[PDB]
């Protein structure tokens, strides 16, 4: 049975703004990439399926429990201990006045961790995992660069080894080397720990290397979906063809 | 075991007035365990299109592509994406000219990964990857380095080793030896022969006459 | 003579945080790319050379006038009428409580525009230039997606046809199609109007297609510089080699 | 006019233990206006390395690469990146197998752009681009469409047309006709002949014997 099941999900701020009639499944150890036009409803959908925006229509089932039929307490418990959420703007997923170490350790303590030294050591290890120097642990995120904030948010949302991570453009602000580090980290987590990921991205290379399936969104509607390689290499919808044709081609020397 | 029945595929180019580009027309094919069938035709005939359809990378517009997943018959043209993903994980293997890997991973780990994903112990995967890399005469100094830092031939050999790390019952090959020299091409041919001996249904595209003659057991005309 | 001249420029928050001893020239009708590790000092340098951060050492000359020896009034006049600045976080370059039309029209009115209808028409034309529907003119940026905010910021900073535009990761949050639209727009402005651009980017494809020269920054130091194609295809510094090797390779069908 | 004197180029691979990979050793070469010199050697000899050094895409470790920019001699190995940029704008032209353009721009505009950057009137640029595209038998239906939506041969022909839009005094060619058929290769050879007739110093890399014999005026051995 699917870890997450989305049926006829709809949320529209206005006639065209948001998403309408979105359905998909997700299982453990799988990545659902979401690509499409800027302003197509990807962030809105990610919020809705991550218990942050009540849909107007449709249902979300997590482990065969309707997401928005649950109590608010249960949803917050899921978002504290079970799920991870990486926001498009990194600071939206961080505590500005809390050090990086504290930002990471909040999640660990939410899972019952109560040893300060172990929490700090894990935070430093995860800072080194995302190539943030461990000597920045006590610095506030406001002193971090955009990419550093992004990586801190990722580390904060991955430290508890969640069963399901929603990510909005996680590679934003990352250099290609640290981007590759992050892709390897996520792939390893998915394959080993059976982590499931829903990743919104505009980098079709990241989608190709990471996403097991893809959803192409235009004007709030999923216009194409299926195997990532099939969608990117054999697009059927005109918009998907335009998107793949707009990719910046590289050359091999 | 492979059974392709009446697979037709037109490409629609919406970016240019939506012109239709027929490629495969009611293509039919059958492959037995331990048998190798090589697609034969001119450039643009549709060899790669058919081979990619067999791998589910392309979606035939009409027809059936039945494969023996374990002891079940699965039609790729209608199978859910999850089923195709697991089929690729265990049943159907693919080898081509381009290595698509996460950049900063070493070649040894790149080769090991497909077998590790199957749950095989890490030591066994490392031993098999080292065996395969040695067979394709890839220097040991390059094993712990990222493939992107190597030459084209070394990268292609690493790609082939990654392709042969898992004993896929069904194997698909697209010009694996095109950029390889005589010795490397011979090693790849030996690997293909060994895979065929163990009971692998192999579908390949080869341009070298010698390689095709050495490896091919049946010829599939792609002209129609 | 160079439109902008940077000599021995240094600004360090701490020993390693920021940039140190940076020198380069820029001329009209040219694009200086800045690439490098996240947290290498690119945003700090861009702020310093754009009259937003006083350097500790070195000099910046604009049209043969020292930038920070000028009065604050002159620097603000440059940033109002002469220059454009695109921030890494789009909202930092936008007025949250001002409509998109107002965000664009502020710059026009700063250049002496005083016809409301013409200002609104130009704002709509530039919204269509960045593929934002013209019917979003009266909506606040808070209702915009991240990429929409990015494009609104770009339109706001390009509407006055500035002689010099500093951009921090302008392609962040943009789909590949609208990214290509933006690249064509910037290239056309540079070639026709002789616009000069200093663009920080992590997308080496954008740098290759847009930048005439590159600076590569590591830990606050320019470790390599020169012709874009030479830097990307014949890197000498180990970090540049690592960066180019980390690029996600694509395939042609 | 081209004068390459003692250009040596080793590649240092820091990503793999910093191993040195010598390619060019005190390479010397000279090209006259209206003369075509073709580099000759085996794969990996360093033909592309030398050709890219002539275009400043590679930076020779030692040596001089002097070109006649207008009525001045400019050494690419030491020229400021700004001088090289203007040299490419006016003096040195490059044609290769891969078209690097902004995606969503039409082929006609792609071909026109190098000449437009020189200030030539738009109508003249459009007429010349149409002439070049017709000569390379590129269908008119594709002129107002982005090159990325075409086939490899059409994209390469558009790249060649973009290369020949400006009458560069110095021209560099890297396998322009490799993927082209007989008629397209003949058209490219005719374009090269016309460019040579007007007084273009051409340096080329060709693998086809017929094309090299038709076009080449002198042979430069790249084995040493
Ligand atoms: N994804 C695609 N989109 C559009 N057209 C395609 C696509 N894949 C293939 N084609 C076109 O369909 C036809 C089939 O080409 P294909 O690559 O299958 O030929 P081939 O010579 O047999 O291949 P290969 O040389 O890889 O063995 C050609 O016109 C090719 O341009
Ligand atoms: N940018 C580079 N970085 C590292 N090694 C390189 C680079 N460019 C070339 N080489 C290597 O230097 C040697 C020169 O190869 P090159 O491409 O010049 O040969 P070629 O056969 O003459 O070229 P072409 O087939 O393009 O005419 C080869 O070993 C190549 O791998
Ligand atoms: N609070 C809001 N009020 C009104 N419209 C909104 C609001 N938030 C987002 N939108 C609109 O909904 C659409 C979807 O936005 P979003 O999901 O963020 O796009 P993207 O897929 O680019 O993330 C956009 O066109 C945006 O303008
Ligand atoms: N206000 C600040 N106080 C202390 N350190 C800072 C501050 N702002 C930035 N830094 C540090 O300076 C370095 C350069 O940051 P920045 O220029 O934003 O990097 P990037 O090149 O990724 O944009 C980073 O390592 C960052 O942690
Ligand atoms: Mg978004
Ligand atoms: Mg093909
Ligand atoms: Mg920055
Ligand atoms: Mg070469």
Residue numbers in the entry:
A (entry chain J), C (entry chain I): 3 to 255
B (entry chain L), D (entry chain K): 1 to 224
Question: What's the paper's own text on this?
Answer:
To capture potential, additional conformational states of the complex resulting from the ATPase activity in PhnK and PhnL, we next purified wild type Phn(GHIJKL)2 complex in the presence of ATP and EDTA (to initially prevent ATP hydrolysis by PhnK), then added excess Mg2+ to initiate the reaction immediately before spotting onto cryo-EM grids and plunge freezing. Cryo-EM data collection and processing under these conditions yielded structures of several functional states including a high-resolution structure of the Phn(GHIJKL)2 complex extending to 1.9 Å using a final set of 222,056 particles and by imposing C2 symmetry. This state is essentially identical to the structure determined in the presence of AMPPNP, however, close inspection of the PhnK active site in the high-resolution EM map revealed that it contains ADP and Pi and consequently represents a true ATP post-hydrolysis state. We also observe binding of ATP to both nucleotide binding sites in PhnL, but despite this, the dimer is still in an open, ADP-like state. Structure determination under ATP turnover conditions allowed us to capture a closed, post-hydrolysis structure for PhnK as bound to the core complex and ADP + Pi. For the ABC transporters, this conformation is difficult to capture due to fast release of Pi and energy upon ATP hydrolysis, so this result might suggest that PhnL serves to control phosphate release from PhnK and therefore potentially also provides an explanation for the requirement for two types of ABC modules. As hypothesised above, PhnL could potentially function to inhibit Pi release from PhnK post hydrolysis and thus control when the energy generated from ATP hydrolysis is released, likely to break open the core complex as shown. The EM density suggests that the C-terminal region of PhnK becomes more ordered in the presence of PhnL.
In Escherichia coli, the 14-cistron phn operon encoding carbon-phosphorus lyase allows for utilisation of phosphorus from a wide range of stable phosphonate compounds containing a C-P bond. The crystal structure of a core enzyme complex, Phn(GHIJ)2, revealed a symmetrical hetero-octamer consisting of a compact, central tetramer of the PhnI and PhnG subunits each interacting individually with the more distal PhnJ and PhnH subunits. Here, we show using single-particle cryogenic electron microscopy that PhnJ mediates binding of a double dimer of the ATP-binding cassette proteins, PhnK and PhnL, to the core complex. ATP hydrolysis induces drastic structural remodelling leading to opening of the core complex and reconfiguration of a metal-binding and putative active site located at the interface between the PhnI and PhnJ subunits.
